[PDB]
Write a protein that binds this ligand. Structure first.
Ligand code: U03
Lengths: 97, 99
C-alpha cells in the first residue's frame, strides 16, 4: 500500500460488507451501518472537532485483506469508516520508511 | 525505520526550524499542527474531522525536516487536540503500509 491513494479496502464484519479506511492514528475502530446485537457497553470517543457516542462490542469476526481475525469494534454515527491500530496490529501490518 | 503499531507512531519534526511532536496518520489527506507562526502565504480554511468542524489557516511552500529528510509542503495550523502529518507529507517521504 503506497500512500498516493487512500488506503480504503473492503471488509466483512460478521458477514456484512463495508468499505473501511486503514487509519494509523486511530486507537480504536468505528463503523456505521452494521447491526451487531444487544451485548454492548456505551463509550464516548473524541477526536478532531469534538466527541462521538459509540456502542462497543468484543470478539467480532472480521475478514479483510484475505485474513480472518477476531477484534473489538465500535458502531456509531461516524462520517467515515475506520479500522484503527487495534485491528491493524492484530492483522500484522506495519508502517515503513 | 519501521513502526510496529503497538504504540502510537509519534515523531519530532521542525516546521521552518521550530520543533513539534506529531503523529503519523494514514487516513487523513492533509496535515495540521497547533502553536506555530510562519511567514508563508496563507489562506483561511475549515476542516471537518471525526467530531465536527474547526477553523484554520493554510500555508503553502513550508519547509519541513522529518526523519532526516527535507520537503516543501502544505500545512494547516489551528487549535487542534492532536498534531498530525497526513498523506500529503508521507507520500513525499516514501512511506508505505506493509503486510
Ligand atoms: C485525531 C485522530 C483521529 C481519530 C480517529 C478515530 C477516533 C478518534 C480520533 C482522526 C482521524 O484519523 C481522521 C482521519 C480522516 C478524516 O477525514 C476527514 C478525519 C479524521 O479526524 C480525526 O479526528
Amino acid at each position: 500500500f503506497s500512500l498516493w491513494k487512500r488506503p480504503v479496502v473492503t471488509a466483512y464484519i460478521e458477514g456484512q460488507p463495508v468499505e473501511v479506511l486503514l487509519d494509523t492514528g486511530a486507537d480504536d475502530s468505528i463503523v456505521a451501518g452494521i447491526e451487531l446485537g444487544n451485548n454492548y457497553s456505551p463509550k464516548i470517543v473524541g477526536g478532531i472537532g469534538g466527541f462521538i457516542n459509540t456502542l462497543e462490542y468484543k470478539n467480532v469476526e472480521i475478514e479483510v485483506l484475505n485474513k480472518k481475525v477476531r477484534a473489538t469494534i465500535m458502531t456509531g454515527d461516524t462520517p467515515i469508516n475506520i479500522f484503527g491500530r487495534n485491528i491493524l496490529t492484530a492483522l500484522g501490518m506495519s508502517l515503513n520508511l
